[PDB]
Design a protein around this motif. Structure first.
Motif, mmCIF file in Angstrom:
data_model
loop_
_atom_site.group_PDB
_atom_site.id
_atom_site.type_symbol
_atom_site.label_atom_id
_atom_site.label_comp_id
_atom_site.label_asym_id
_atom_site.label_seq_id
_atom_site.Cartn_x
_atom_site.Cartn_y
_atom_site.Cartn_z
ATOM 1 N N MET A 166 0.822 -1.197 0.000
ATOM 2 C CA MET A 166 0.000 0.000 0.000
ATOM 3 C C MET A 166 0.866 1.261 0.000
ATOM 4 N N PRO A 167 1.783 1.329 1.002
ATOM 5 C CA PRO A 167 2.675 2.469 1.126
ATOM 6 C C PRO A 167 3.782 2.417 0.072
ATOM 7 N N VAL A 168 4.591 3.466 0.057
ATOM 8 C CA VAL A 168 5.687 3.551 -0.892
ATOM 9 C C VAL A 168 6.725 2.476 -0.564
ATOM 10 N N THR A 169 6.729 1.432 -1.381
ATOM 11 C CA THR A 169 7.661 0.334 -1.189
ATOM 12 C C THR A 169 8.912 0.543 -2.044
ATOM 13 N N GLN A 170 9.755 -0.480 -2.063
ATOM 14 C CA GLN A 170 10.985 -0.424 -2.833
ATOM 15 C C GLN A 170 10.672 -0.272 -4.323
ATOM 16 N N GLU A 171 10.006 -1.283 -4.860
ATOM 17 C CA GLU A 171 9.639 -1.274 -6.267
ATOM 18 C C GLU A 171 8.914 0.026 -6.619
ATOM 19 N N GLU A 172 8.426 0.693 -5.583
ATOM 20 C CA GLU A 172 7.713 1.945 -5.768
ATOM 21 C C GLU A 172 8.699 3.079 -6.059
ATOM 22 N N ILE A 173 9.743 3.135 -5.246
ATOM 23 C CA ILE A 173 10.760 4.161 -5.404
ATOM 24 C C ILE A 173 11.835 3.662 -6.371
ATOM 25 N N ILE A 174 11.678 2.415 -6.788
ATOM 26 C CA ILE A 174 12.625 1.808 -7.709
ATOM 27 C C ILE A 174 11.995 1.729 -9.102
ATOM 28 N N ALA A 175 10.727 1.347 -9.122
ATOM 29 C CA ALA A 175 10.001 1.229 -10.375
ATOM 30 C C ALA A 175 9.263 2.538 -10.659
ATOM 31 N N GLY A 176 8.725 3.119 -9.596
ATOM 32 C CA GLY A 176 7.993 4.368 -9.716
ATOM 33 C C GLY A 176 8.920 5.507 -10.145
ATOM 34 N N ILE A 177 10.106 5.516 -9.556
ATOM 35 C CA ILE A 177 11.088 6.540 -9.867
ATOM 36 C C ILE A 177 11.756 6.211 -11.204
ATOM 37 N N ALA A 178 12.244 4.982 -11.298
ATOM 38 C CA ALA A 178 12.906 4.532 -12.511
ATOM 39 C C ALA A 178 12.115 5.016 -13.728
ATOM 40 N N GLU A 179 10.807 4.816 -13.662
ATOM 41 C CA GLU A 179 9.933 5.226 -14.748
ATOM 42 C C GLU A 179 10.052 6.732 -14.985
ATOM 43 N N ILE A 180 9.997 7.478 -13.892
ATOM 44 C CA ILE A 180 10.098 8.926 -13.967
ATOM 45 C C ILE A 180 11.464 9.309 -14.538
ATOM 46 N N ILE A 181 12.484 8.605 -14.069
ATOM 47 C CA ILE A 181 13.840 8.861 -14.523
ATOM 48 C C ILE A 181 13.892 8.754 -16.048
ATOM 49 N N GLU A 182 13.073 7.856 -16.576
ATOM 50 C CA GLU A 182 13.016 7.647 -18.011
ATOM 51 C C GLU A 182 12.262 8.796 -18.686
ATOM 52 N N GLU A 183 11.842 9.747 -17.866
ATOM 53 C CA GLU A 183 11.113 10.899 -18.367
ATOM 54 C C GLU A 183 12.004 12.142 -18.345
ATOM 55 N N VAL A 184 12.719 12.299 -17.240
ATOM 56 C CA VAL A 184 13.609 13.437 -17.080
ATOM 57 C C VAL A 184 14.955 13.121 -17.738
ATOM 58 N N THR A 185 15.640 12.141 -17.169
ATOM 59 C CA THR A 185 16.935 11.734 -17.688
ATOM 60 C C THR A 185 16.762 10.887 -18.949
ATOM 61 N N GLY A 186 15.566 10.335 -19.093
ATOM 62 C CA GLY A 186 15.259 9.504 -20.245
ATOM 63 C C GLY A 186 16.003 8.170 -20.173
ATOM 64 N N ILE A 187 16.392 7.810 -18.958
ATOM 65 C CA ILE A 187 17.110 6.566 -18.740
ATOM 66 C C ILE A 187 16.112 5.408 -18.688
ATOM 67 N N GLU A 188 16.647 4.201 -18.798
ATOM 68 C CA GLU A 188 15.818 3.008 -18.766
ATOM 69 C C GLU A 188 15.246 2.798 -17.363
ATOM 70 N N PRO A 189 14.078 2.101 -17.317
ATOM 71 C CA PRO A 189 13.420 1.826 -16.051
ATOM 72 C C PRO A 189 14.149 0.722 -15.284
ATOM 73 N N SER A 190 14.408 -0.371 -15.986
ATOM 74 C CA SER A 190 15.095 -1.502 -15.385
ATOM 75 C C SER A 190 16.550 -1.132 -15.088
ATOM 76 N N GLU A 191 17.040 -0.149 -15.829
ATOM 77 C CA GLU A 191 18.409 0.308 -15.656
ATOM 78 C C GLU A 191 18.599 0.901 -14.259
ATOM 79 N N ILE A 192 17.648 1.740 -13.873
ATOM 80 C CA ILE A 192 17.698 2.380 -12.569
ATOM 81 C C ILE A 192 17.648 1.308 -11.479
ATOM 82 N N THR A 193 18.556 1.440 -10.522
ATOM 83 C CA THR A 193 18.625 0.494 -9.422
ATOM 84 C C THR A 193 18.850 1.230 -8.099
ATOM 85 N N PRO A 194 18.663 0.477 -6.983
ATOM 86 C CA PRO A 194 18.841 1.045 -5.657
ATOM 87 C C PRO A 194 20.326 1.219 -5.332
#
Length: 115
Positions: free
Chosen positions: A1-29
Motif C-alpha cells: 500500500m505504502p511507498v515500497t521499494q519497487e515503488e521508489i525503484i520502479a515508480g522513480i525509474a519510470e520517472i527517470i526515463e522521463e527526465v533523464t530519459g534513462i531506462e526503467p530496469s536500468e535504474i537500481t537502488p
C-alpha cells in the motif's frame, strides 16, 4: 500500500526515463544520484519534483542535499513514516557504516572516452 521499494525503484525509474530519459530496469537502488545517473542534480531535481508529487513524499532540498543514493532517497521517505527502523533497503554492514553496494574486489581498472 505504502511507498515500497519497487515503488521508489520502479515508480522513480519510470520517472527517470522521463527526465533523464534513462531506462526503467536500468535504474537500481545501487544508484548514487550522480555517480550513476551522471545527470547531475539538474534532472534528478525533476525526478523528485515528480515523485514528490505523484505520491507526495517528503524530500525537500533540506533532504535532497543529504540523499546520496536511492536507499537514502527512500529511507528519508519511509523512515519519515515508519517502515524499517534500521537504516533502509540496502544497508548490509553496520548502520553508520552504510554501503549500498557490497563491494568484494578491487578497482582502478576502468578507463574513459573523453571528447
Amino acid at each position: 500500500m505504502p511507498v515500497t521499494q519497487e515503488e521508489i525503484i520502479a515508480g522513480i525509474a519510470e520517472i527517470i526515463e522521463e527526465v533523464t530519459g534513462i531506462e526503467p530496469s536500468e535504474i537500481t537502488p545501487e544508484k548514487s544520484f550522480v555517480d550513476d545517473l551522471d545527470i547531475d542534480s539538474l534532472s534528478m531535481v525533476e525526478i523528485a519534483v515528480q515523485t514528490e508529487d505523484k505520491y507526495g513524499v517528503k524530500i525537500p532540498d533540506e533532504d535532497l542535499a543529504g540523499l546520496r543514493t536511492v536507499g537514502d532517497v527512500v529511507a528519508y521517505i519511509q523512515k519519515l513514516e515508519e517502515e524499517n527502523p534500521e537504516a533502509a533497503q540496502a544497508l548490509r554492514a553496520k548502520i553508520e557504516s552504510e554501503n549500498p553496494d557490497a563491494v568484494a574486489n578491487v578497482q582502478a581498472r576502468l578507463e574513459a572516452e573523453s571528447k
